[PDB]
Amino acid sequence: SWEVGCGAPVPLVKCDENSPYRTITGDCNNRRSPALGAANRALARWLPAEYEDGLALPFGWTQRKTRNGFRVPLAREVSNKIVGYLDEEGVLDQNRSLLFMQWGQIVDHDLDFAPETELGSNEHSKTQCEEYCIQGDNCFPIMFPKNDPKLKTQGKCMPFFRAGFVCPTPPYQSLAREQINAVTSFLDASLVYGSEPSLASRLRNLSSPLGLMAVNQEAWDHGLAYLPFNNKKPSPCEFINTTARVPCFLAGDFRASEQILLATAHTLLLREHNRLARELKKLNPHWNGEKLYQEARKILGAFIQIITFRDYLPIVLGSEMQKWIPPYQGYNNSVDPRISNVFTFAFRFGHMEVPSTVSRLDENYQPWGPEAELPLHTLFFNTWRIIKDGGIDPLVRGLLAKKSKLMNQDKMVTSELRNKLFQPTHKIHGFDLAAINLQRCRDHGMPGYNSWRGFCGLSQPKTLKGLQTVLKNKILAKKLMDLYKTPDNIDIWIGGNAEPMVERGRVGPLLACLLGRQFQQIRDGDRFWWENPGVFTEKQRDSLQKVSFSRLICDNTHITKVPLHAFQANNYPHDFVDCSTVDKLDLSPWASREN
Numbered sequence: 001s002w003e004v005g006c007g008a009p010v011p012l013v014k015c016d017e018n019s020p021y022r023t024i025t026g027d028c029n030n031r032r033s034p035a036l037g038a039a040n041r042a043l044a045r046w047l048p049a050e051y052e053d054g055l056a057l058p059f060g061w062t063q064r065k066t067r068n069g070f071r072v073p074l075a076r077e078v079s080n081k082i083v084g085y086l087d088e089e090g091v092l093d094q095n096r097s098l099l100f101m102q103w104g105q106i107v108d109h110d111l112d113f114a115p116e117t118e119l120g121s122n123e124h125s126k127t128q129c130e131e132y133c134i135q136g137d138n139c140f141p142i143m144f145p146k147n148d149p150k151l152k153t154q155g156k157c158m159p160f161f162r163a164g165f166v167c168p169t170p171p172y173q174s175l176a177r178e179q180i181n182a183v184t185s186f187l188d189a190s191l192v193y194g195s196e197p198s199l200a201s202r203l204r205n206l207s208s209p210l211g212l213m214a215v216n217q218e219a220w221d222h223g224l225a226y227l228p229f230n231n232k233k234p235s236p237c238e239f240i241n242t243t244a245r246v247p248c249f250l251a252g253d254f255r256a257s258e259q260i261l262l263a264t265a266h267t268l269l270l271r272e273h274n275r276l277a278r279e280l281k282k283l284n285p286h287w288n289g290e291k292l293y294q295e296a297r298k299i300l301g302a303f304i305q306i307i308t309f310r311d312y313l314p315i316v317l318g319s320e321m322q323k324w325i326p327p328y329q330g331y332n333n334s335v336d337p338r339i340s341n342v343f344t345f346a347f348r349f350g351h352m353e354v355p356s357t358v359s360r361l362d363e364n365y366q367p368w369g370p371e372a373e374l375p376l377h378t379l380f381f382n383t384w385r386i387i388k389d390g391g392i393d394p395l396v397r398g399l400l401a402k403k404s405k406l407m408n409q410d411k412m413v414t415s416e417l418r419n420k421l422f423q424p425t426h427k428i429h430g431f432d433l434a435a436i437n438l439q440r441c442r443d444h445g446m447p448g449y450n451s452w453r454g455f456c457g458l459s460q461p462k463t464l465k466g467l468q469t470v471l472k473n474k475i476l477a478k479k480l481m482d483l484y485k486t487p488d489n490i491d492i493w494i495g496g497n498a499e500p501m502v503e504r505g506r507v508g509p510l511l512a513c514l515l516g517r518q519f520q521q522i523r524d525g526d527r528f529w530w531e532n533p534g535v536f537t538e539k540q541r542d543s544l545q546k547v548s549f550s551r552l553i554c555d556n557t558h559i560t561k562v563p564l565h566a567f568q569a570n571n572y573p574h575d576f577v578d579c580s581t582v583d584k585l586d587l588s589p590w591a592s593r594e595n
């Protein structure tokens, strides 16, 4: 029944068998099926795609075509009715540092990307979608409902383009449309080094034979590195301030400069890599360039896996952590490590942890200057506030001392992102991340909220009352039921995020199920997982077991006052200890006597 498979726009797969390092494309991780968990392959489908025409059109494309008997609500109306809120007071998460939100976006980025289809450069098609809001082909305009304030100041719609899809990049009509995952499903640091050989090398500094990742030669941070700029025009980091004229950064992942704190976390990672490569050279001066890069790359990948799985995942999953992520039992080659399509949506829960402002803090963690605190939207693709305004050291203090937004049923997504998002090649701070998310669900042909509840062994509410009992919220149930006239139709994104938080965790039962499963697969089906016997030496594993985000800060910034548990709420100077009382990553176990 299920064919051997389509694979036109994907090259050859030739796997070096002795190779002890990962490939940049992620290819060859799994021996029996070497394309599993590799960039540029279709996202996996845990459940059949659901499309309007059961092939490729998204629901809500043909006004006359209903879903389960009903019309799907406009993405922006749902957003306006449910997602939006005015009052930023009392919305901070008392037990999560803002670093909690940041680590989430870092991991999400390392895992999946599903970029839009290409048909817009040297073609004005991109402007024809924007200008006349005509739905066609890839252009899938997010229309404004009747009472929208944006109707008055912005037009009839918000531009939107369908995500790219495997095999043909013009419409094919036999198997359902499968979108592409442009990065490697492995927690490999793809976001630091690249997912394409072509990027991966450019990012490198091949001049010196020291295995360094190339840095910015135009500007520094107290003698500390900055990612190289990307000299591709037009640049949104230039468009936001045309007087400053500072371009976006060049990183392993394309979206690195979308907001200043991600740009910031990317800055810390590159530094650790360089810091590692210099430390290794000293111990093993005989090591060639490649070895230094690979060994360094290998370590940072382990670092991300420990932080994410030991410190991050448990505070996201809490009570459900063990249920889906039992302690490691070793590599299983029968585990599918490909990121599933719906996970790329489950993981957007992070969007409700983004608060309306960002601050810069001095050495006693106090307001750094006149405008230490800034509105989040002035930070989208803002690179000049880092180079021209104090380095990352101030911003990394805000990441430790401020809180993330708490998910709230009456306050889901802050307007900075809801009304004011900036998208490249478009001119305004006037977009909606919520609306986009919803439209993306439909574009990916996502099954409704009950299919996913079914998928997780949870009940499937069919009535208003049924929904209320699940969400533990009358008014929220009433609104959803008014917009989608049946739970069966609630877009997974808004659906999963409406459930209350499970104990000790920051997501509901449905997302804990979907997230947990994926991460469990990420770990168990990855031949190069740091704790998988034989990847690192038992001694090395003991060295690694001691890493901490605090340590990464201390090593890569001039901050000497960090908390111990980076992800929880920590105030200064009480919960802050000197860096010396914090374990280091002793790299001695990497000495290589070959005499």
Ligand code: HEM
Pocket (backbone or CB within 6 Å): 101, 102, 103, 104, 105, 108, 112, 113, 114, 115, 258, 259, 343, 344, 345, 347, 348, 349, 350, 351, 353, 354, 417, 433, 436, 437, 440
């Ligand atoms: C300032 C903070 C953030 C901004 C500005 C931001 C922005 C965006 C944008 C513009 C998209 C593309 C929307 C589309 O599909 O067209 C996106 C997608 C996404 N976001 Fe975020 N985001 C932020 C934080 C987060 C966080 C904290 C998480 C998780 C903790 C997260 C998870 C995701 C995921 C999983 C995707 C889909 C990636 C894919 O296409 O595979 N985001 N975000």
Ligand SMILES: *[C@@H]1O[C@H](CO)[C@@H](O[C@@H]2O[C@H](CO)[C@@H](O)[C@H](O)[C@H]2NC(C)=O)[C@H](O)[C@H]1NC(C)=O
Pocket (backbone or CB within 6 Å): 240, 241, 243, 244, 384, 388
């Ligand atoms: C564009 O970037 C410039 C350059 O930093 C910003 O200009 C500075 O902002 C304040 C003045 O209000 C000063 O402290 C800096 O010295 C200024 N530099 C210059 C050359 O004016 C400016 O605020 C940014 N503009 C926007 C719209 O973001």
Ligand SMILES: *[C@@H]1O[C@H](CO)[C@@H](O)[C@H](O)[C@H]1NC(C)=O
Pocket (backbone or CB within 6 Å): 205, 207, 208, 210, 212, 213, 214, 215, 216, 217
């Ligand atoms: C490459 O490495 C050399 C030696 O450390 C350094 O001086 C040079 O600036 C680096 N080049 C880039 C682009 O990073």
Ligand SMILES: *[C@@H]1O[C@H](CO)[C@@H](O)[C@H](O)[C@H]1NC(C)=O
Pocket (backbone or CB within 6 Å): 329, 332, 333, 334, 335
């Ligand atoms: C390996 O994966 C398969 C499929 O997920 C599963 O049935 C099997 O139990 C796994 N092996 C172990 C040791 O759990």
Ligand SMILES: *[C@@H]1O[C@H](CO)[C@@H](O)[C@H](O)[C@H]1NC(C)=O
Pocket (backbone or CB within 6 Å): 095, 315, 565, 567, 568, 569
């Ligand atoms: C804060 O979070 C940590 C985990 O980061 C947890 O162990 C601690 O008990 C939490 N505090 C409260 C008040 O829940």
Ligand SMILES: O=C(O)/C=C/c1ccc(O)cc1
Pocket (backbone or CB within 6 Å): 254, 255, 256, 257, 258, 424
């Ligand atoms: O164009 C870019 O550089 C990136 C935009 C973006 C898309 C998804 C994100 O999660 C963050 C930024």
Ligand SMILES: [Ca+2]
Pocket (backbone or CB within 6 Å): 110, 111, 183, 184, 185, 186, 187, 188, 189, 190, 191
């Ligand atoms: Ca990856």
